[model samples]
Target: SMSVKKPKRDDSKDLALCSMILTEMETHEDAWPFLLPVNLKLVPGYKKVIKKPMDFSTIREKLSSGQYPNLETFALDVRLVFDNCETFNEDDSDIGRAGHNMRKYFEKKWTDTFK
Candidate 1:
């Protein structure tokens, strides 16, 4: 059993999602799956530009100030996460399949919420 380390991805969208998801996850109140804290010391530089996710008051009074703007905009941002991850993650085995399913989750959420 061998799992190759996924190649580093260009930050932009991928990095944005990391911050966005983490930020949203914290604001979200499900509380079933606790958000694991990130350790910056371990992350490589390319991954560093991505800052923490925006807040919520929902962006803690940030929503009224247009945290997401609308569900459609949110969908596009979520789609970015799926698009970038699959590009490098690829399809071959468990990790690949896991990425595929994960994207599917984002894709499903996008479609469900947008329209």
Candidate 2:
């Protein structure tokens, strides 16, 4: 009887999962402009980090060190999302008002949390 061999498990898959999560988080209808550029810049390094998801922890630690690269990228993506959302529905009064309120919320969050 021939024995069947099982495929080896890949630990690197976790990085892919993290990358997907990050991608999904940035998938809101209004975040493309900011996300595209920042993501393009990070693509090269992003591959390396995919295999080492814990590097995200290190990145978080750097936030307080006053050397913001990742956080800035994240904020840019968020702002792009906000701007797109605001402009896309500008014709609708309700949507416009909501977008305006949301933009204020985003601005406040950005200032209070990051700055």
Candidate 3:
């Protein structure tokens, strides 16, 4: 018998950290690979779709039950990234704008997830 495995919870903490790391990578291309490991582990199942653009609804569903264990750590990393953003030269040009856009996008997604 083939049984479907239940999807994991939203792990907002991880999501938050991942988003911030990605945002950092936007301004600092050198950091992208360094952050890859963390991102890969955070959203184990949804990596493919999320690697592109998507809505927050899916994340919301996973997080609704609030069963994730690493949310706190995730939040901490997010704060760290946001605090350090000024230290890096963030790009604000058309391409640079993509990073800002993604940061907001994930923040909104996380908000929606916990809402």
Candidate 4:
């Protein structure tokens, strides 16, 4: 016989923080390209290269739906947007530069809020 259990923790504080961060990211000039998922059809080979595509809008929905169990989980997905961008776009490219700028802003906010 075996017993199973699920741990519970209140993540409401982080949830609110996530929402604030989203608002800031959405308004950022460099956030345009990452506001939504990359158009796979428009950019061929995108699907082949990036397996787990994440974006600000999707993260917002996930946060609203209570999908993230903790701040760390939410942060990972946030970083994923830039990680995928760097993998698919050149650093000097417009979208790539935007990604870099967005990532820098996100990390700064993350530190300011949590660290």
Candidate 5:
């Protein structure tokens, strides 16, 4: 037996799921608004309203680096992206509806796989 840092947790499997979900989201039609960081210049007052910005790219980086400690942590970041969208965009706006659909799709996938 080799002495090691710690036991490998099932969190690795959860990370894999996270990766899968992220890929699906990136390809989703509603993903356009969430694939990258918001343009501060284009979106006036964004910086003032949303302090912590989350996006598919950042989520990928966090997942790649094992920064997410658990499935819930990973899920929270995903939810935050949509939450930010709702916070900033009016419900009738294009980006807002996209975010809503993206979140609905994500939750459905998460439930199907993990629930």
Candidate 6:
């Protein structure tokens, strides 16, 4: 299933951390790899598309649902999304900036996951 809709923001819950992270990645095309979930329709050796960009709202929803086991795990999950991605240049390119910014956001909000 393809969730191609652009992510929307919501104010019904505490999503500040998630919001901040998304704002960084959503501004550029290169951030697609960082924000998008892999296309399940693709099979082995088949090229996958970068769509269904998951932003803060989805992250917030997941947080609100208590799907994460702990703050450390959640932080790692978010960080890895940006970390696993290969930025063009650290703190230079759009993807790099997005990665740097996401790291900062995580550093500042790590405590919130347990709240």
Total clashes for model 5: 0
What is the Cα-based lDDT of residue 75 in candidate 4?
A: 91
The reply for model 3, stretches above 4 Å from the true place, is: 1-69, 91-96
Query: Per-residue lDDT tens digits of candidate 3, residues 33-101?
Result: 223332446644445533332222323333344433466544444434433333232576443454355
- lDDT values of the candidates? 0.43, 0.44, 0.44, 0.90, 0.90, 0.52
Please give the distance, in angstroms, between residue 25's alpha carbon in candidate 2 and its true position after superposition: 12
Better of 2 and 4 by lDDT: 4
Q: Arrange candidates, best lDDT first.
A: 4, 5, 6, 2, 3, 1
Instruction: Give the per-residue lDDT digits (tens) of candidate 2, residues 28-48.
Output: 353333333224255455444
How does each model score on TM-score?
Answer: 0.40, 0.37, 0.34, 0.88, 0.87, 0.43
Model 2, which residues run further than 4 Å from truth? Answer: 1-69
Which clashing pairs does model 3 show?
10-62, 13-74
Candidate 5 residue lDDT tens string, 44-106: 899888999999999999989979888889999999999999998899999989988999999
TM-score of 2: 0.37
lDDT of 2 at 19: 43
Between candidates 1 and 5, name the one with more favorable TM-score: 5
Prediction 1 global C-alpha lDDT: 0.43
Name model 1 segments beyond 4 Å from true. 1-65, 109-114
lDDT of 1 by residue, 1-115 (tens): 2787788644345334534543544454431122332234774541454443221222324333556654545555444443434444447755456546655555554444333
Show model 4 residue runs off by greater than 4 Å: 1-11
Residue pairs with backbone overlap in model 6? none
In angstroms, the error of model 5 at 36 is 0.5
